[PDB]
């Protein structure tokens, strides 16, 4: 079989670099790919908003299987595309990809279908809004509903602050019809993880749960990022907390969906916040996470590409999880999340520990040596059988290939060690 992994980050590389393992595959594409990933995946200079060569392109392949790495072709249905082309695809419609497409029907299918989430409502007038949060005062959250690239959340710990930000959204439009509407929700607090699961119809098939540093700078103060590392398990989180979320939050979330008409195939992304009133709903992704996906694939035993086939087909999945941990940790250029530098030269990146996986998010090849070319740069990943294990030897391997130019946080897994003991 050859299968086809789309979108180019660091996300991507790990499914190319677990497709490959597989004993169904003879050829793995990625499109485009990048290329710390070409040991994986034979690169195809098709870009992913390019729906019409994806499709041009697997079907003239003969690409049995394609995974589908980032949720804007999925939002634009990059899906029901291929299945035009009757090319076997993973991934929701766009239909479902609405689940994460648009918050304000993710918080309105919750709250009719009983699921746990922060209490909200959704404004289109700026005055009402304004008005809302003067109600309720801060803390507040504001969304703006459409995607927005990931810097549309402000958690406000003023009216002023939450005002301002309603401006931006409502009245400057900053996200354009992303931020034509908005979600304000009451403010959560406690540990934040994420739940991945495996989605079709109503069969769920939970995934081994991630939890990631959203913040730039240690001990979490800073901007935000797409991630400056992750780790699975979480060993501060029960077993019964996580198999609890599965049958009140996504089984129920995954039958929602079916029962409007948007039924989902795909990974559904919970993330999820531990309060101490139970487990709520931030949010859904209607894809694999980033950088989630890179410590727990790792963690998968079984044959990736097997379990989709068989999921896709509707036949008995046979999932099964590894004992082992995995933690990453992101090599970020200067300046992000801001402005970033691209053009830095930071060696062959491939570290002399191992038991470790660099999975390459921005990087271009150039002069025998790979460059920056992106704003997060590379997920150093180890694995080990326990968790702190696996977290020493990350930074091991972070001290290796780290060259000039990059940053990084070294408290990754850090409180989460603590906390567990
Ligand atoms: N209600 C909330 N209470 C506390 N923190 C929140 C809330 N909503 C979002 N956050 C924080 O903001 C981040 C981004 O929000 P999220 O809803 O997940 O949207 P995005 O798609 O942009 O990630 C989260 O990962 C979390 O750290
Ligand atoms: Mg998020
Ligand atoms: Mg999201
Ligand atoms: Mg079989």
Redesign the pocket.
Known sequence: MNVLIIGKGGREHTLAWKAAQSSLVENVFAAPGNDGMAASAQLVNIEESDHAGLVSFAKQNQVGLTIVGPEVPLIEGLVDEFEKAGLHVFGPSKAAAIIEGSKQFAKDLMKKYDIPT?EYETFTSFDEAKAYVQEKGAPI?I?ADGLAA?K??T?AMTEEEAIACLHDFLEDEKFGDASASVVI?????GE?FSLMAFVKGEKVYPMVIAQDH?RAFDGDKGPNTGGMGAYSPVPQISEETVRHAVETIVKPAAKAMVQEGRSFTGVLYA?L?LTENGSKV??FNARFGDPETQVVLPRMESDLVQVLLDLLDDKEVDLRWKDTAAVSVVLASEGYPESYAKGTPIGSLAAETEQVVVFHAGTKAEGGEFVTNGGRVANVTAFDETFEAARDRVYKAVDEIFKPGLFFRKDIGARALKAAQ
């Open positions: 922060a959250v969304k990931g549309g959340v958690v929700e009451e403010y959560l607090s934040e959203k993330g916040m931030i949010e």
